[PDB]
Each structure stands twice: as structure tokens, then as C-alpha cells.
Amino acid sequence: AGITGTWYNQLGSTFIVTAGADGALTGTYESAVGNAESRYVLTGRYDSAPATDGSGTALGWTVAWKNNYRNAHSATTWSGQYVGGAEARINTQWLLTSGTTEANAXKSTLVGHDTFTKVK
Amino acid sequence: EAGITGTWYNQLGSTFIVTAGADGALTGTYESAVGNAESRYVLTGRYDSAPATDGSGTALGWTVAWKNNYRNAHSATTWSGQYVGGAEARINTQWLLTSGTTEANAXKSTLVGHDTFTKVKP
Ligand SMILES: [Cl-]
Ligand SMILES: [Cl-]
């Protein structure tokens, strides 16, 4: 239940996700708040029976940066964990891969981190 | 991709089977140990469904949560990479494996590695 909803990073991005009962994540990622030309499909998975033990819940998702306005020839994956409660957060690291020639394949993949919370 | 749809093998004994939807969806199954049915997990992801015309790879990514009816590892792995078609077709990836952790152990939460998938067993 706790994952379903809207989340915001610290830079102006948003997503909206629904967590299905058997582990599915589906939704939309908006790279710039309030901009509908910046919406992309998100698909992923989560562990649908995490540990009672005060641990986070592991999850991941992908966005391919193609919609009817933009085709960046790239995709990003986020890997992380949801921690519920009053300061709920999804703490992630991400990999962004761009389609490249074989000669440029070594500069194909950027890495970073994102922390999502439930307020802007 | 006609090209992406099908079965892929890493160099360590894992396999997956994927279907690439016409509007960017990846769906399928990941088997961590070849011909072990208790080792099958749902895979979902995305690819860029209109890659460049010009011998560039096709970007894609997917997630497996390591839970099925036999195992719950309390973890999920994401792969990010690119498909390169042709004679020696490959999907070259880097992966992130995150485990659910306590807050004290959160800095030990995420493993990183790489995987190269081909269309024939290693
Ligand atoms: Cl589900
Ligand atoms: Cl599709």
C-alpha cells in the first residue's frame, strides 16, 4: 500500500506508481513538474512480502526516455528500497544507458542517486 | 525489436526469456540457474522502440524482484544496457542489486556488477 502514490525527488521530478498485489510496479515518470510533454511510462517490480523487521522493501523500475515528444535513445533504471512511516522515502541509485556505437560503448552508462519523498 | 525478443544467456548460467512489445514494453522471465524451474522470476522493463538508424545499440532496462513461490530474497536487481543485433548479437549491461535493509545497514544495501548476454549458451 505504502509505495502506491506520487513521489518527488529533490530536483523537480515526479512519478506516480501503483504497486500491484503480486509485485508489479506500473506508472508514469515526469522529468519536469507540471510538464505533460515530459511524461514517460515506468514499469518495475518490488518484493511484495518484505521483512517485518524494520527493513526497507526492495524495488526497482525502468523508464525508456521515449514518448510522443522526445526520443532520447536512452533508458534509466532505478534500484532501491522503500522505507515507510512519517518521513517515508524511496532511496535509490540509478543507471542511465544511452544507445551508442561500438566505439563509444565505454561512455554508454551514467550513474547517480535519487531520494524520493512524498512531499515536493 | 524482433531482435530483442527471445532467450538470452549470460556467461554464468543464467537465462532469460523476453518479449519486446511494439510500444516499448519488456516482459518475461529470468531463471538464475539453467533448467531449474524453482529459480524462475518475473522480469519487466522498457526499451527504446525507435532506436537510431545507424549501427548504434538500442537502450533498454529491466527489473527482477527475487521473489517467487520458492524463494524470497528480499531484494531486487535492475539491469541497464543496450542491445546490439547481428551476427554476434549481445545485450551488454550493468546491474544494481538492492537488498531491503535496516537504516543502520543501508550503506551496505546495493551491489553493482556487469553482465553480457548472448543468444547461445556460454
Ligand atoms: Cl501485481
Ligand atoms: Cl508495448
Ligand nearest to the CA of B49: 2
The dihedral formed by the CA atoms of B92, B31, A52 and B104, expressed in degrees to the nearest 10: -30
B16, three cell numbers? 532469460
Experimental method: X-ray
Rounded Cα gap, residues A5 and A19, in angstroms = 9
Question: Do B30 and B38 form a contact (C-beta atoms < 8 A)?
Answer: no
A22, three cell numbers? 503480486
- Domains of chain B by range and CATH? 6-118 (2.40.128.30)
Amino acid (1-letter code) at residue B46: R
Between the CA of A64 and the centroid of ligand 2 the distance, in Å, is 12
The dihedral formed by the CA atoms of B80, A28, A59 and B20, expressed in degrees to the nearest 10: -50
Nearest CA to B30 among B61, B57, B7? B7
Entry resolution (Å): 1.5
Chain B: closest CA distance from residue A108 (Å): 8
Rounded Cα gap, residues A43 and B93, in angstroms = 18
Between the CA of A98 and the centroid of ligand 2 the distance, in Å, is 20
Contact A64 B50 (CB under 8 A): no
